[PDB]
């Protein structure tokens, strides 16, 4: 409305000065704009220069537009409506400016406005844009489509929200009118728009699906890459949610996608390749592939080679390899006749790129085809071992990974034939001069450590020699993997790590990196998780190290809780904290408490850990509760004297976290209640027992959750209970003989004495591999008691019948 000459000359002057090649003039223009941007009339001038000053050249008009855009995304709340509306009007009025740079700038402006200040503060953006599609001038329709496309991209919840009153029941049938359109750009926009609303199963589209699918087929023949790409990705998404609709055309579709997977445009080929990934998740995959699988496997295998440019994330190679992995899991051994001739031509090829693809294939199919591959492994594994010292780094690294994919088989064979040389050469490769090899080797060794477990004990010194040595060699990316390897080693070899030499060489560099990291460095996550395992493993010895670690961890929990409260108080000024610092800190405290046990009392005596835990147990985030209940169980065992005052408060929460939807929260709560039981509690039993019985009869997690529930129910055995013995026995008969099993069986003996039942499982379960004498006498006293109280015992399998004469017949 009111641009005056002095103002215009001054702002144009500032834009010219901002375009100076001189670096100092730029920095002071920066502070000058810094000040000016907070005055709305300045924004009025900026938009005026963008849209009205035809006189000025394009980079000036565009720079004005972009500065304005930055202001509209750090200061838009404080914009009054008169200026906002002047910008809005001028944008929609200039959306099709004949300069591409101006057009693009206006576009960023529109989309950034819609973004920062939500789509309803602009009630009429979409309607005008939509009507602007029908306009004559090409640039106008192109610009409007571009804007809509961006809006649909990031503002996708336009249908599920319904804030602007069904903002898609108009647009979608309008996009589908433009599939037919003469210009490739507009077709592309139309499809890219619609595509945003497929996986959501958006009503407006779903009730137009036939028109959609038909127009897509009509488009299949299009040679403009962006259209092919978008059709391809349309079909891929459609395949996930409306399978029914495309069954009748699947043969022709598979033919099309298989053609496009071989497309010369990398992007088309990649979008096509997604088809195999998502098709492999549908149960009709085999039936649909019967006519095409023989061609499909070699195309994927061939696409798994590194690209020419890659020889220097998601790409054709990775997609193809993932597709092969899933197909291997679908077809299992039926795939091997398709894949073995390719492997024979690839694994020994003289061109390293081809060999590399072969090793990749060999790894990819491992999970699905493991059984079928066993016959060939006595030849392939030694060969892979040789490849570990291939002179091409990318061969070494992929070999590392594939071997790790066959670690189980390697471990199950005699150690000297495969395991020993593999571990030796993996260790060598950990100290490779190539960083990709280094991390591949460390990761693969971690996987092997995990599978081998105790089988590593004899090589412990050489392993530690290498892992420690890696500290001085490794950069940042790779220290993370190194910590994971140390952690898994400690978990694998347990207490065997507790030797003075090992502690002295391992701990100092761990503390060294501990001292470098600040409480805000995410690189704490692997180190602390490593320390937790080391602490649990080093049981006796860590003592000289616990103090700073305990304090720092507790402190991290404290400051996390603080930041969370502060953010809950003022979200617009204080960042929500990353709760992983808290989860990891709890997890290390759990490990410390398990390792040191009772010897952590002195540290807990000086601590508010229980008061922090009280808030952790009530956290919204499941992993925080799971960690806090774990720490609760460990401290219950280690130093109950500090916990007892809190039990009356803690128990109703444990009672409210016996929800099997969260397996590990429910589990850790249950375990906690078992440990606390042993230290105690009649009034708390009713709030927990019914749920535990529900959990033990539930047809899910027939493993660790049920055993702990059983143990806990067993522990709650020292009460007047009133079945559940069927799954209890079923669950507990399969666990190793330890203290927990003892406690639970004492409970079942006391409980049977009070309400004797007519479903012997107990007897089958009673077959203890060497129970302590008092527990045995309890058993044979109850058994003998029943015998004093057959055709039924005829049904005992021989091992049972025989065992129950050695101890109690």
């Amino acid at each position: 409305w009111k641009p005056d000459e002095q103002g215009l000359q001054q702002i144009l002057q500032l834009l010219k000065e901002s375009q100076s090649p001189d670096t100092t003039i730029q920095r002071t223009v920066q502070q000058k704009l810094e000040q000016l941007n907070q005055y709305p009339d300045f924004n009025n001038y900026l938009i005026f220069v963008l849209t009205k000053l035809k006189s000025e050249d394009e980079p000036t008009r565009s720079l004005s537009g972009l500065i304005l855009k930055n202001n509209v995304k750090a200061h838009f709340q404080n914009f009054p409506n008169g200026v906002t509306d002047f910008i809005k009007s001028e944008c929609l009025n200039n959306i099709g400016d004949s300069s591409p740079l101006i057009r693009a700038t206006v576009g960023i402006l529109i989309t950034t406005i819609a973004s920062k200040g939500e789509l309803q503060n602009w009630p009429d953006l979409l309607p005008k844009l939509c009507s602007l599609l029908d306009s004559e001038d090409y640039n106008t329709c192109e610009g409007a489509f571009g804007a809509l496309q961006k809006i649909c991209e990031d503002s996708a919840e336009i249908l599920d929200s319904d804030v602007l009153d069904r903002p898609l029941n108009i647009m979608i049938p309008k996009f589908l009118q433009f599939f037919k359109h003469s210009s490739p750009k507009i077709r592309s926009h139309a499809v890219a728009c619609v595509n945003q609303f497929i996986i959501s199963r958006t009503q407006a589209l779903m009730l137009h699906i036939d028109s959609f699918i038909e127009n897509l087929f009509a488009l299949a023949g299009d040679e403009e890459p962006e259209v092919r790409k978008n059709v391809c990705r349309a079909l891929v998404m459609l395949l996930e949610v409306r399978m029914d609709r495309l069954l009748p055309h699947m043969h022709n579709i598979v033919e099309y996608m298989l053609q496009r997977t071989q497309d010369q445009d990398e992007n088309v080929a990649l979008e096509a390749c997604e088809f195999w990934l998502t098709l492999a998740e549908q149960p009709i995959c085999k039936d649909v592939l019967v006519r095409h699988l023989p061609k499909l496997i070699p195309v994927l295998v061939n696409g798994m080679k590194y690209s020419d440019i890659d020889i220097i994330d998601w790409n054709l190679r990775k997609c193809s390899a993932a597709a092969l992995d899933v197909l291997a899991n679908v077809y299992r051994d039926e795939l091997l006749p398709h894949i073995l001739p390719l492997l024979k031509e690839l694994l020994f090829h003289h061109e390293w790129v081809v060999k590399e693809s072969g090793i990749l294939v060999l790894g990819a199919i491992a999970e699905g085809c493991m059984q079928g591959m066993i016959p060939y492994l006595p030849e392939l594994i030694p060969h892979l071992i040789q490849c570990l010292s291939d002179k091409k780094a990318l061969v070494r690294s992929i070999t590392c990974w594939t071997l790790s994919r066959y670690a189980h088989w390697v471990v199950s064979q005699p150690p000297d034939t495969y395991l020993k040389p593999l571990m030796t050469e993996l260790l060598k490769r950990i100290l490779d001069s190539n960083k990709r090899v280094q991390e591949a080797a460390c990761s693969a060794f971690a996987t092997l450590e995990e599978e081998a477990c105790t089988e590593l004990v004899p090589y412990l010194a050489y392993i530690l020699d290498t892992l420690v040595f890696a500290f001085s060699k490794y950069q940042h990316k790779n220290l993370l993997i190194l910590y994971d390897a140390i952690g898994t080693l400690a978990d694998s070899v347990g207490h065997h790590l507790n030797k003075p030499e090992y502690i002295q060489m391992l701990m100092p560099p761990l503390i060294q990196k501990w001292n470098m990291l600040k409480d805000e460095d995410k690189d704490l996550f692997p180190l602390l998780e490593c320390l937790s395992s080391v602490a649990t493993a080093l049981q006796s010895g860590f003592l000289p190290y616990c103090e700073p670690v305990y304090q720092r961890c507790v402190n991290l929990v404290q400051k996390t809780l603080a930041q969370a409260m502060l953010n809950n108080a003022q979200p617009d000024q204080y960042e929500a904290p990353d709760k992983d610092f808290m989860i990891v800190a709890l997890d290390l405290l759990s490990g410390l408490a398990e390792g040191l046990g009772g010897n952590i009392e002195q540290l807990v005596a000086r601590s508010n850990i229980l008061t922090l835990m009280y808030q952790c147990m009530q956290d919204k985030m499941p992993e925080v509760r799971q960690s806090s209940f774990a720490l609760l169980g460990d401290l219950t065992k280690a130093c109950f004297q500090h916990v007892k005052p809190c039990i009356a408060d803690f128990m109703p929460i444990l009672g409210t976290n016996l929800n099997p939807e969260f397996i590990s929260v429910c589990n850790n709560a249950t375990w906690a209640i078992g440990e606390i039981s042993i230290q105690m509690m009649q009034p708390y039993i009713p709030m927990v027992l019914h749920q535990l019985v529900e959990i033990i009869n539930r047809p899910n997690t027939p493993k660790t959750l049920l055993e702990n529930t059983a143990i806990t129910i067993g522990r709650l055995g020292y009460v007047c209970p009133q079945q559940f013995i069927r799954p209890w026995c079923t669950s507990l008969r399969n666990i190793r003989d330890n203290e927990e099993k003892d406690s639970a069986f004492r409970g079942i003996c006391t409980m049977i004495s009070v309400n004797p039942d007519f479903i012997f499982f107990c007897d089958a379960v009673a077959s203890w591999i060497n129970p302590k004498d008092d527990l045995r006498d309890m058993f044979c006293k109850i058994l003998h008691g029943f015998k004093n109280q057959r055709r039924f015992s005829d049904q005992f399998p021989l091992p049972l019948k025989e065992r129950l004469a050695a101890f109690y017949g």
């Binding site: 995990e450 993997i481 978990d491 997890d587 992993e623 590990s664």
Partner: peptide, 19 residues
């Protein structure tokens, strides 16, 4: 019998993978 922790899963997530 005992607590469930996520350490191992977190390490597998961080582990090097070709795809």
């Amino acid at each position: 019998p005992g607590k469930m922790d996520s350490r191992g899963e977190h390490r597998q997530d961080r582990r090097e993978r070709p795809y």
